[PDB]
């Protein structure tokens, strides 16, 4: 009933190599450990035109529906995808996400439309730092 | 590789009401007259969340311009959100998110068209892309 457009770019670095950094956004299993608490349906197809449907809830709460579609893929360098999140019957937002990693200095960019989200994103990267060595 | 991120907005009012202008976006036939032609290459239009669009055209014998879009959100007569990627030949020039808002303007319609895009490798079509959309919206005007 009202849209707010914001673009926030957050930067974070990783002593691990770029291929590894990219691996954390490419591999199906690797992404399940850290979701990009039951999980109903879940699909992944890491290619252009490929999707990433994801239905889930927290402690019996309402279900969060995530639908993403990969727009542009540059092996070990760039990942561009759009996605929408809903928690209702209640669309939360839709955004275009760019994740670049030059040799690592991953540069996370999110151009979104909201029907705030930034701080959580810096966190999603602080977590990236987590499973960053779990191997 | 490089990625340019930019956003632009275009406001344009119409003497028509929301139902009318929304329609011009949601009705395949109408759509095919102000944005695309189709009357003497390809145009799949499935207007629904999750549904998408596919357009393929070229001028003369030149490179085929392909636009692939998917609807992300639809609020009747008031909002349209879709993402899309464009390419000419095999070179993918960009991916972006589009938001179309239609707020009542007393007796007319307020249309704010916002485009958050990501232009690929060297290519900076942001300028050229806003130019065209500003034209397509002007063209829409006549269609109403």
């Amino acid at each position: 009933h009202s849209v707010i457009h914001s673009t926030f770019t957050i930067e974070r670095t990783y002593p691990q190599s770029p291929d590894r950094v990219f691996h954390a956004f490419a591999d199906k299993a690797t992404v399940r450990r850290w979701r990009v608490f039951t999980v109903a349906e879940f699909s992944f197809d890491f290619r252009v035109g490929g999707g990433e449907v994801s239905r889930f809830s927290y402690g019996g709460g309402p279900e969060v529906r995530l639908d993403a579609q990969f727009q542009d893929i540059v092996p070990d360098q760039r990942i561009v995808f759009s996605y929408r999140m809903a928690i209702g019957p209640q669309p939360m937002s839709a955004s275009l996400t760019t994740v670049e990693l030059t040799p690592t200095r991953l540069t996370y960019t999110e151009q979104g439309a909201f029907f705030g989200r930034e701080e959580g994103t810096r966190g999603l990267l602080e977590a990236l730092a987590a499973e960053l060595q779990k191997w």
Side-chain angles (χ1 to χ4, degrees), chain A residues 9-11 14 98-102 104-109 125:
Chain A
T9 322
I10 306 181
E11 301 201 5
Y14 304 97
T98 314
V99 47
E100 301 179 71
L101 25 72
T102 70
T104 311
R105 182 188 63 178
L106 163 156
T107 329
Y108 220 72
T109 308
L125 276 193

Side-chain angles (χ1 to χ4, degrees), chain A residues 14 34 120 123-125 127-131:
Chain A
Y14 304 97
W34 70 299
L124 72 81
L125 276 193
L128 177 61
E131 84 303 309

